[PDB]
């Protein structure tokens, strides 16, 4: 009588055969799954048929009495009443280190180099390879936290500046990732799905735990990167009709129409805010309505309306000030083929909306991080012309400089201010140019024959144009763009795909330190100390 002693008696069990016993027990398990689970199941047999009595053993008293009181009194098939009776010292190096030059990400020859390539002196340090844990890339989270594997071998955490092994997360058959800015979460996405008992092709595990914070299934994928916000207090996670929220980490869905929307195309998290914007496909009379909202107040304060629009893609200012919507709309009313931007002003009072038109459509867009300028590039691949706009805080915006017979369509935005790098490097050639500020000029051209992509450093130190192996031929080089015409890189390492900044912490800077740099006058020592190091 010792041990479990948890044998029960569930009356009004139906008599069935042995071949239909699996389907009948699954319906009996689904009925018992309201308050419990099945770990031991037995049924008596009378001449091959069931006797009419079965048992569900739990091996504790507590929920076996509660499931007995929740299953009795109900007439089962139509008529029969069932009756149941029974580390921090090592890792975060890159803020307070000696040099403060922006590191990069290195991959060449698909596993023959997995490294960091330095902002170098052509010295031996850093001499790097990190062995055989990753096939596809050395891949980072936005706090610099990771050197990772995108592979079936898993999703990997490795910390330090010197590639120490921290943590290995469970993924078989993985296709993708999603990375947090605030170093709170990570995701993996799998192209081979798991079984329906815990149905998942989005398996997402926290950065702290190495175990799943939320997990759910995925049947379709529109584009690359269910992402994390600047602070990560609220997130957006749907499956394939919806927009609704998953909370950090509890997957809390709210009952709001404001945080949970029906049937929209595109959404974001704001660069400065806790704020979500979207656009809705139009009804017959009712407009296409982009909404500016707040999450925890559960209300729509700000609704833009524009009649006779077809589609919209969103671009926020990278400090969260302005939101420009580029349309592929031409009016059905007028013949004229013209596009418009609705520019909101979120930080200014009562959200003004201004319009600025063009005679042509746009192929790109750029919003300036921390600047009172704006760069807008419109036109086809032979006719891609960029216009540098200067938008004040109070007033309207205008156009300063338009260039005929230009192809500069790739814009790498620096964190330093007052400088833009403009490349024509998409898939016919590379043509680079620097767009400086106060005054706007076209002053320089750096030659690149191999490069495909242009992105800049989180300090303001380098905007790099580099090459890809499986998208173009072997013409290979690495030529990054410095502002002064000086050479920023010389490297050819075979089958290299990218080189981009491994990021740094939140700086939490002040205006007083920039005011001292707002004063040769005191900055005289740094060239002379370099001259003693360059002596022979």
């Amino acid at each position: 009588a010792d041990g479990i002693d948890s044998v029960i008696v569930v009356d009004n069990v139906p008599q069935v055969g042995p071949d239909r016993l699996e389907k009948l027990k699954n319906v009996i398990h689904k009925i018992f799954s309201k308050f419990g689970k099945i770990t031991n199941d037995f049924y008596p047999e009378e001449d091959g048929k069931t006797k009419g009595y079965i048992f569900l053993e739990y091996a504790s008293p507590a929920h076996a009495v509660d499931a007995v009181k929740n299953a009795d009194g109900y007439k089962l098939d139509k008529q029969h009443t069932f009756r149941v009776n029974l580390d921090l010292g090592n890792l975060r190096y890159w803020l307070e280190e000696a040099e403060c030059r922006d590191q990069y990400s290195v991959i060449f020859e698909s596993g023959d180099r997995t490294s960091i390539f330095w902002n170098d002196v052509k010295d031996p340090v850093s001499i790097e390879e990190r062995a055989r844990w990753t096939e596809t890339y050395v891949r980072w989270s936005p706090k610099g936290t990771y050197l990772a594997t995108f592979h079936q071998r898993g999703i990997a955490l490795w910390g330090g500046e010197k590639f120490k092994q921290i943590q290995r997360f469970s993924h078989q058959g993985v296709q993708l990732i999603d990375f947090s800015p605030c170093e709170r979460y990570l995701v993996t996405f799998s192209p081979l799905m798991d079984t329906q008992d815990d149905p998942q092709a989005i398996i997402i595990w926290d950065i702290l735990t190495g175990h799943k914070k939320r997990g759910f299934h995925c049947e379709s994928s529109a584009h690359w990167p269910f992402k994390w916000s600047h602070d990560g207090k609220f997130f957006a996670r749907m499956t394939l009709d919806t927009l609704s929220i998953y909370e950090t980490p509890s997957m809390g869905l709210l009952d709001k129409k404001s945080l949970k929307i029906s049937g929209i195309k595109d959404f974001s998290w704001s660069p400065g805010g806790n704020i979500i914007a979207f656009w809705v496909p139009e009804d017959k009379d009712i407009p296409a309505r982009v909404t500016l909202m707040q999450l925890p107040t559960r209300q729509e304060i700000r609704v833009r309306n524009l009649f006779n629009v077809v589609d919209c893609k969103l671009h926020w200012q990278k400090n969260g000030d302005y939101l420009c919507v580029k349309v592929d709309r031409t009016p059905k009313g007028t013949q004229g083929v013209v596009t418009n931007f609705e520019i909101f002003r979120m930080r200014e009072k009562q959200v003004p909306v201004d319009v600025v038109e063009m005679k042509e459509t746009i192929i790109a867009f750029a919003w300036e991080p921390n600047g009172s300028k704006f760069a807008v590039l419109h036109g086809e691949a032979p006719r891609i012309s960029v216009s540098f706009y200067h938008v004040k805080n109070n007033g309207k915006i205008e156009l300063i400089k338009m260039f005929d017979k230009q192809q500069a369509n790739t814009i790498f935005w620096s964190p330093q201010g007052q400088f833009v790098v403009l490349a024509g490097l998409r898939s016919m050639n590379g043509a680079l140019a620097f767009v400086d500020t106060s005054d706007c000029t076209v002053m320089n051209i750096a030659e690149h024959y191999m490069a495909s992509d242009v992105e800049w450093d989180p300090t303001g130190r380098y905007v790099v144009t580099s090459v890809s192996w499986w998208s173009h031929k072997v013409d290979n080089a690495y030529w990054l763009w410095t502002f002064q015409g000086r050479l920023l890189q010389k490297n050819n390492k075979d089958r290299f795909c990218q080189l981009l900044w491994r990021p740094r912490p939140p700086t939490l800077l002040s205006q007083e330190q920039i005011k001292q740099i707002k004063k040769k006058i005191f900055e005289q020592k740094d060239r002379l100390s370099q001259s003693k190091a360059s002596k022979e």
Partner: peptide, 27 residues
């Protein structure tokens, strides 16, 4: 030059597993 001047759980998991084991034994 202005830039260069600027330059320079185990107990909780065990308690969760014990709570999961107690819930599964009840169920």
């Amino acid at each position: 030059e202005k830039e260069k001047k600027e330059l320079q759980i185990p107990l909780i998991k065990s308690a969760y597993e014990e709570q999961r084991i107690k819930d599964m034994d009840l169920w």
